[PDB]
Amino acid sequence: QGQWDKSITFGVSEAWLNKKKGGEKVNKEVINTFLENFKKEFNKLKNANDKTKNFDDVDFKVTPIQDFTVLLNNLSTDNPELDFGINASGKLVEFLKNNPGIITPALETTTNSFVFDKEKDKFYVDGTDSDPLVKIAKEINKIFVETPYASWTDENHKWNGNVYQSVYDPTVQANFYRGMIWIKGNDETLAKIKKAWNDKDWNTFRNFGILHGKDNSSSKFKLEETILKNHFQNKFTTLNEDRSAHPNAYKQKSADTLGTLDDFHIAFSEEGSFAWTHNKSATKPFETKANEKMEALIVTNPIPYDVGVFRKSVNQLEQNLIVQTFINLAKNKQDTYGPLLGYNGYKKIDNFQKEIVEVYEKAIK
Numbered sequence: 305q306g307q308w309d310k311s312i313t314f315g316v317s318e319a320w321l322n323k324k325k326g327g328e329k330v331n332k333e334v335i336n337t338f339l340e341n342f343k344k345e346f347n348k349l350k351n352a353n354d355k356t357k358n359f360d361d362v363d364f365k366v367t368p369i370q371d372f373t374v375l376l377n378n379l380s381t382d383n384p385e386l387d388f389g390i391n392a393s394g395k396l397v398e399f400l401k402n403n404p405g406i407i408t409p410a411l412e413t414t415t416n417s418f419v420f421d422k423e424k425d426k427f428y429v430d431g432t433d434s435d436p437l438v439k440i441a442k443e444i445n446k447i448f449v450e451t452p453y454a455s456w457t458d459e460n461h462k463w464n465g466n467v468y469q470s471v472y473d474p475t476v477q478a479n480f481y482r483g484m485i486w487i488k489g490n491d492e493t494l495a496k497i498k499k500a501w502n503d504k505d506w507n508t509f510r511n512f513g514i515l516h517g518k519d520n521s522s523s524k525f526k527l528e529e530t531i532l533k534n535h536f537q538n539k540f541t542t543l544n545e546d547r548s549a550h551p552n553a554y555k556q557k558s559a560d561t562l563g564t565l566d567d568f569h570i571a572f573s574e575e576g577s578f579a580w581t582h583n584k585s586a587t588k589p590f591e592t593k594a595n596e597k598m599e600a601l602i603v604t605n606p607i608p609y610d611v612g613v614f615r616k617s618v619n620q621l622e623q624n625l626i627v628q629t630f631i632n633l634a635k636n637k638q639d640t641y642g643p644l645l646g647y648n649g650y651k652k653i654d655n656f657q658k659e660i661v662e663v664y665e666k667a668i669k
């Protein structure tokens with residue numbers, strides 16, 4: 305059942321924690337109140353329960369981590385210096401295929417649903433105008449193109465320094481997210497790209513140039529690859545093999561810079577990434593040439609949101625109290641940390657294989 309650890313340390317992103325604005329480090333002060341609230345709630349539950357009241361009260365700390373690879377590798381060493389961290393679901397599923405049972409998934413995060421994507425169970429069918437994934441892309445275009453993103457105001461779209469609130473329905477928690485495919489060009493170029501998609505002409509489609517993320521990204525690489533493979537049946541085996549033979553058609557860059565590269569017209573991103581990108585950023589996100597437009601072509605199959613995982617030897621009773629502490633803090637609106645990352649809710653994982661692995665695998669087939 306594991307060892308009771310009187311000191312629990314959460315791993316958090318170095319970039320995030322060591323982050324500041326106008327020279328003011330404010331993230332450190334956010335996680336500080338988060339930790340005070342977490343400690344309070346945890347030991348209250350701990351002490352109110354006869355099964356756990358005799359263990360030592362627990363202190364909570366955080367430690368900054370380089371990247372997810374360091375997080376999963378560090379957790380797998382089962383060292384009490386690092387007990388817990390929240391990781392992207394697809395990366396974790398891949399990690400756990402190669403190193404089964406090595407770490408313990410326990411918590412599932414949820415996020416405010418987008419108003420245009422409230423139903424998880426929508427999947428690729430044929431990529432035509434009646435495809436449910438194309439229909440979500442048309443809904444995105446209403447929000448992002450018809451009322452042009454560049455003209456949104458903080459007030460208009462209710463920016464809260466974190467996200468544009470008007471694009472969300474907080475009454476609905478989504479235990480999922482998707483990737484999406486963007487296209488960009490003048491009218492003639494956009495029609496050509498759509499024609500190549502409608503005609504299933506892979507070579508022409510690909511030669512318009514694709515921006516993508518890291519090869520191990522779900523939402524900026526693998527989920528889009530799945531859609532492309534299913535849509536352009538039998539025209540390539542993997543994106544990596546296609547790129548090897550067609551290097552100039554691919555570039556690793558953020559979708560919000562698509563408008564600045566004349567040679568590229570297609571980009572992968574998280575669904576709705578504009579929702580947490582201030583349009584006033586000095587980097588002019590999603591900006592395009594005057595006679596060009598950027599629009600959504602299609603979104604992807606859905607996969608779970610981020611998963612909280614423990615090193616293996618943390619006492620199981622302790623793990624479940626920690627999971628419940630996250631749930632109650634969000635419910636009591638005492639979680640000052642989560643929403644800064646997109647976590648607006650938490651659920652216990654009851655069956656990892658059914659709730660996480662299977663959902664992910666269905667999405668990428």
Ligand SMILES: Cc1ncc(C[n+]2csc(CCOP(=O)(O)OP(=O)(O)O)c2C)c(N)n1
Nearest residue numbers: 392467521522523524574580643644645646
């Ligand atoms: C306020 C806010 N909402 C949403 C996000 C985006 N987001 C947070 S967790 C997550 C799911 C995992 O995505 P990611 O870590 O990019 O893994 P990938 O899809 O690249 O494998 C997303 C899309 C954010 N950064 N901030």
Ligand SMILES: [Ca+2]
Nearest residue numbers: 311312313384
């Ligand atoms: Ca510890």
Ligand SMILES: [Cl-]
Nearest residue numbers: 353354355356
């Ligand atoms: Cl109990």
